[PDB]
Design a protein around this nucleic acid. Structure first.
Length: 746
RNA sequence: GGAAAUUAGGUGCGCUUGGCGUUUUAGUCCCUGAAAAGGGACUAAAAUAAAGAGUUUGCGGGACUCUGCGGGGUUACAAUCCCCUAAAACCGC
DNA sequence: CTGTTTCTGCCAAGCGCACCTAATTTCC
DNA sequence: AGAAACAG
């Protein structure tokens, strides 16, 4: 009973095979198919950036209304129309900002000047390698800016309502169409608003000193990085302790001792030269004095001029060490470096440093240092290993003397636990990798439930993901005793050579079944192909209701006049959900994650209610089935009243059994989409294999070819059979028991 | 294969911002037309997922903060269930 | 009740964390 | 990737 489970873990597929006594017992393929979190992050950053601009502008509008005795409501929009302070014939802010250098402004003029500069305050050139387009433009604009008093005068005189080359068109002041030519560093716009205040002061404009200070601080405030201390990794030994910052004295001591001790021992392995703690203390004393230890010194402190494993001038290069000591308890010192590493907000860093006995000159000095990066071990481990290494002992000798062992799991389980509950979790942030590991666990645990414990697991695929899955499996899974190494990896170059040897080289390269023949290879002829023909490829139904609520292109309602039937058709489309109106903007739907299938109780005809991401957001469950329309109008949809009974809900990759009147037998297919314009289905064959197509399947998949087996535009209304099924992760097909229609809450 | 370190180049996740683009309401400048009807360039302002939540402190506020297109767990299936997934300051009494 | 085409938001600068890869050192 | 208008 040599029981083996083999897995071909792909980017979007899981092939698995089960062998026992050199006999293939079961086969299957699990198809779970740019970055996942990226669009969510971009939309998140954009929301926060604009929400903060809005509140920043509202804050200035409050200050302007309070200082100038103006109306705050006159700077907000009402009835989706222009704010009252901006109505009528309007002098541009570019002209107002030029006048401010020469004459007194009206307080209505100064109000619009402040708000115009603050809305687009320019790029904060903090850093100042290859320079991108925006960095090129701020430098090119900086050189032109030296001939002008302010940014306002520069834009007003060089571009505002000035005609381009041999044209009757105004050139652009704002940037246009993928060009960044007008980008100007934010510090210059702060200089302009400071100059405008001073010049208006000379011209007789009266305002409290607190007003200008508040306006400047509010308009140009920028938050530091949000607290990220939770994202720091943990120690290899003490998993409950955070990693130590690299720029702490202990870490400097540990790293310096690591290079020095290892170099002295390296010379023993190479030249048999035995050095002492004194020869160690000499090299360490040179590090502790300047944080530096060039190779030229070290060789002179112990021999000739030699080339041992080299690169550059410095052997030890603690760049930030000298700055740390120049800016100034051992535990408080390491705790200070941690605060400098983590608290990027200088004011919050000033407050954190203030809890320690240090003068104001030291606190301001320590607040300016930039620390980053961490070791892989904690301060707790450094407090133990470093004293022994100070005595000249290597890292491994110190760990063995202290009985320090790397943390590893001891309680192995029958089933593989959630990857989130292992100490390998913090190593993986990529949702793509987390996805593949999840589907590996689900398939493995399903096999364990079906057949029981196994002796061995073989794995093959970025090959580090295989080493990760392997270490994760042998650290946490309990295997059958093979005696009185249970997890192994198969060489990819070897498995590819077996594919050519066993004739499988080009068997089913175009369909989903070839992931299983690879797993059959990982575990180790015509009997093998017999098992492959029995596979039903498993795909999970996609029930996620979240996503973009609508397309991102805002459209005019006139775009739909021809297709929907003018204004009357647009209002009808809005009432049916064929289009949405968000913030007064017409937008198309997002994903149709669900469709609810109904059946007329007396005619037996089927009807479909499409359900979109916006509908879930509204928490309103639609109840009207699509009806086909004439060419240029929208027919009434059909209310699902007591004449229609809910059958089931379909999601992408739901398994269904369908049969048309022209089909002699029903067929299991995967539901892919419901097309609302034609009230029809798109379905696909489980394995996407064109060569095994039966006579009955050719009726349904009349347009199939060697690359895809997909049937589009299949009408649902007169289907003879339309039933929902459920696929397990191993390819088992079960009839879907009736479940009542799932509602939206609140 | 495993523990530690160094240098360099990448990937992902996260955060702080900038500039567009679009829709809307107007304006500046120019253009065809008898009028109708418009057209183009440019400028400003508002909006930029629907919509919600919350302590610090007893209550309230936004001139506060956060959630809102991701992943994991659960299982005839994977979801709207569960977890990753909050916490301060300031103003007023 | 089928068959086919159309249309979809985007880039830039910088700072953090977790990893990967390629070399190099001490070790098991 | 996937909604849905256009087309037959």
């Amino acid at each position: 009973m040599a029981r083996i489970l083999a897995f071909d873990i792909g980017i979007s597929s899981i092939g698995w095979a089960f062998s026992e006594n050199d006999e293939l017992k079961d086969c299957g393929v699990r198809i779970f198919t740019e970055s996942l979190a990226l669009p969510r992050r971009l939309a998140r950053s954009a929301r926060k950036r604009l929400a903060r601009r809005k509140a920043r502008l509202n804050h200035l509008k409050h200050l302007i209304a309070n200082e100038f005795k103006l109306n705050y409501e006159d700077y907000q929009s009402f009835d989706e129309s222009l704010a009252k302070a901006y109505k009528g014939s309007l002098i541009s802010p570019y002209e107002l900002r030029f006048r401010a250098l020469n004459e007194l402004l009206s307080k209505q003029d100064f109000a619009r000047v402040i708000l115009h500069i603050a809305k687009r305050r320019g790029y904060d050139d903090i850093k100042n390698k290859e320079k991108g387009a925006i960095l090129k433009a701020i430098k090119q604009n900086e050189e032109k800016l030296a001939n002008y008093q302010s940014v306002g005068e520069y834009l007003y005189k060089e571009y505002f309502q000035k005609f381009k080359e041999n044209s009757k068109e105004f050139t652009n002041v704002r940037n246009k169409k993928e060009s960044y030519e007008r980008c100007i560093a934010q510090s210059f716009l702060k200089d302009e608003l400071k100059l405008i205040f001073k010049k208006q002061r000379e011209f007789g404009f009266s305002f409290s000193k607190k007003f200008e200070e508040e306006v400047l601080s509010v308009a140009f405030y920028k938050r530091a990085l949000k607290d990220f201390s939770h994202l720091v990794g943990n120690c290899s030994f003490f998993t409950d302790e955070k990693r130590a910052p690299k720029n702490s004295p202990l870490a400097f001591m540990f790293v310096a001792l690591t290079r020095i001790i290892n170099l002295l021992n390296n010379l023993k392995n190479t030249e048999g030269i035995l050095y002492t703690k004194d020869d160690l203390n000499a090299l360490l004393n040179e590090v502790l004095k300047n944080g530096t230890l060039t190779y030229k010194q070290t060789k002179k402190l112990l021999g000739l001029s030699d080339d041992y494993e080299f690169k550059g001038e410095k052997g030890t290069y603690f760049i930030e060490f000298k700055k740390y000591k120049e800016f100034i308890s051992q535990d408080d010192l390491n705790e200070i470096a941690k605060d400098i590493t983590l608290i990027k907000d200088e004011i919050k860093l000033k407050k954190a440093l203030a809890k320690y006995d240090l003068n104001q000159n030291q606190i301001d000095s320590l607040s300016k240092l930039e620390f980053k990066d961490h070791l892989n071990i904690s301060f707790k481990a450094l407090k133990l290993v470093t004293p022994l290494m100070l005595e000249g002992k290597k890292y491994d000798e110190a760990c063995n003397e202290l009985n320090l062992k790397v943390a590893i799991n001891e309680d192995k389980k029958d089933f593989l636990p959630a990857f989130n509950e292992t100490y390998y979790k913090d190593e993986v942030t990529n949702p793509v990798v987390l996805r593949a590991i999840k589907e590996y666990r689900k398939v493995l645990n399903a096999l364990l439930k079906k057949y029981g414990k196994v002796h061995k697991i073989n794995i093959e695929l970025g090959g580090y993901i295989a080493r990760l899955v392997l270490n994760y499996t042998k650290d946490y899974l309990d295997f059958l005793p093979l005696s009185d190494v249970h997890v192994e990896a198969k060489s990819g170059m070897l498995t590819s050579a077996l594919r050519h040897t066993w004739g499988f080289s080009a068997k089913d390269r175009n369909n989903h079944l070839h992931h299983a023949i690879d797993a059959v290879i990982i575990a180790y002829r015509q009997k093998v192909l017999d098992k492959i023909d029995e596979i039903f490829v498993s795909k999970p139904e996609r029930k996620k209701p979240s996503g973009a609520l609508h397309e991102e292109t805002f459209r005019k309602e006139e775009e739909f006049y021809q297709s929907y039937g003018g204004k009357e058709g647009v209002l009808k489309a809005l009432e049916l959900g064929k289009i949405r109106k968000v913030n007064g903007k017409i937008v198309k739907n997002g994903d149709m994650f669900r469709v609810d299938i109904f059946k007329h109780k007396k005619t037996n005809k089927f009807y479909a209610v499409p359900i979109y991401t916006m509908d879930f957001a509204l928490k309103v469950l639609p109840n009207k089935a699509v009806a086909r329309s004439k060419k240029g109008e929208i027919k009434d949809w059909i209310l699902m009243d007591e004449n229609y009974e809910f059958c089931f809900s379909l999601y992408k990759d739901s398994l269904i059994l369908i049969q048309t009147k022209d089909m002699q037998e029903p067929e299991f297919v995967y539901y892919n989409a419901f097309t609302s314009s034609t009230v029809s289905l798109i379905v696909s064959k489980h394995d996407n294999k064109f060569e095994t197509l039966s006579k009955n399947q050719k009726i349904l998949f009349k347009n199939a070819n060697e690359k895809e087996v997909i049937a589009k535009s299949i009408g649902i209304q007169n289907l003879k059979v339309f039933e929902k099924y459920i696929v397990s992760a191993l390819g088992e097909v079960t009839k879907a028991e009736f479940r009542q229609r799932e509602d939206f809450k609140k």
